[PDB]
Ligand binder design. Sequence first.
Ligand SMILES: CN1CCC(n2cc(-c3cc4c5c(cnc4[nH]3)C(=O)N(c3c(Cl)cccc3Cl)CN5C)cn2)CC1
Ligand SMILES: [Cl-]
Ligand SMILES: [Cl-]
Ligand SMILES: [Cl-]
Ligand SMILES: [Cl-]
Ligand SMILES: [Cl-]
Ligand SMILES: [Cl-]
Ligand SMILES: [Cl-]
Ligand SMILES: [Cl-]
Ligand SMILES: [Cl-]
Ligand SMILES: [Cl-]
Ligand SMILES: [Cl-]
Ligand SMILES: [Cl-]
Ligand SMILES: [Cl-]
Ligand code: NA
Length: 265
Amino acid sequence: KSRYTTEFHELEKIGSGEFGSVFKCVKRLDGCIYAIKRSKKPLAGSVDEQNALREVYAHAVLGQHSHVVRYFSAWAEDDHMLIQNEYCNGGSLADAISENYRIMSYFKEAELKDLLLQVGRGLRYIHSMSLVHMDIKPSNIFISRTKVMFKIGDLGHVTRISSPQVEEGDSRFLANEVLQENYTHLPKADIFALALTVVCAAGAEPLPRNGDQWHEIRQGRLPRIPQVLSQEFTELLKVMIHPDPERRPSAMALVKHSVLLSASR
Ligand SMILES: CN1CCC(n2cc(-c3cc4c5c(cnc4[nH]3)C(=O)N(c3c(Cl)cccc3Cl)CN5C)cn2)CC1
Ligand SMILES: [Cl-]
Ligand SMILES: [Cl-]
Ligand SMILES: [Cl-]
Ligand SMILES: [Cl-]
Ligand SMILES: [Cl-]
Ligand SMILES: [Cl-]
Ligand SMILES: [Cl-]
Ligand SMILES: [Cl-]
Ligand SMILES: [Cl-]
Ligand SMILES: [Cl-]
Ligand SMILES: [Cl-]
Ligand SMILES: [Cl-]
Ligand SMILES: [Cl-]
Ligand code: NA
């Protein structure tokens, strides 16, 4: 007799976290298919509650954009918090990249430009709302197939653009200035992470979490990419990982970039 059990039928598990999981569900009254994340509810009044509530608010304010997974509802039950989103039938970008890796057939240049432009429009929107994402990576981006659409789905590190305290995102995608607790240019940390996300989609080996190879990238050196890309596209990716955040393009500049003009729909 919970809301989750009475209003939805679970179809298939489609994601899994430490404190719960995501199911593809059909909603009984409207007949439509949704993705629903169900997680342990944090303590009332706790810091974890504040964090969980911020993530709900980020879905509720960002999900109407075409390149953010759409939000429908969120609720609490006795021991759980639930978020109901659109179901993206193509799954995560990380799983698409994993399959591509296995078969040796990666995203081609035109498809990489589409990914970069589409997630770039998502970031231009997020930044225009005075927010930053803080955890761009393949496992946080979802695919809808019909032309392909990429959508930012996980919003659990979103915070305001001038936040003086930040929960760092995945260390594989994290820009050095954030690691050093410099938060003057937070939008450019999302640009850095998006470039490395595109490098992953271009066929690169798994990125380092730490160590010498991690530091090499933070000097502005792109990882090896196993396919020929144009020099100007490669140069765009490199300047998006520039050690000086101010040299990286804004998301607005990225979506207006001459290199991505061909990708525009
Ligand atoms: C052939 N094959 C069949 C199965 C297909 N498949 C689709 C998915 C899938 C997961 C998922 C989602 C979401 C949205 N659409 C999704 N689609 C989504 O909104 N999620 C979410 C939610 Cl519900 C609340 C808060 C944050 C987030 Cl990130 C995360 N999960 C895991 C997995 N496999 C892939 C093709
Ligand atoms: Cl409902
Ligand atoms: Cl799963
Ligand atoms: Cl939408
Ligand atoms: Cl419950
Ligand atoms: Cl499907
Ligand atoms: Cl735009
Ligand atoms: Cl990932
Ligand atoms: Cl991950
Ligand atoms: Cl710094
Ligand atoms: Cl900035
Ligand atoms: Cl990786
Ligand atoms: Cl380089
Ligand atoms: Cl060129
Ligand atoms: Na949306």
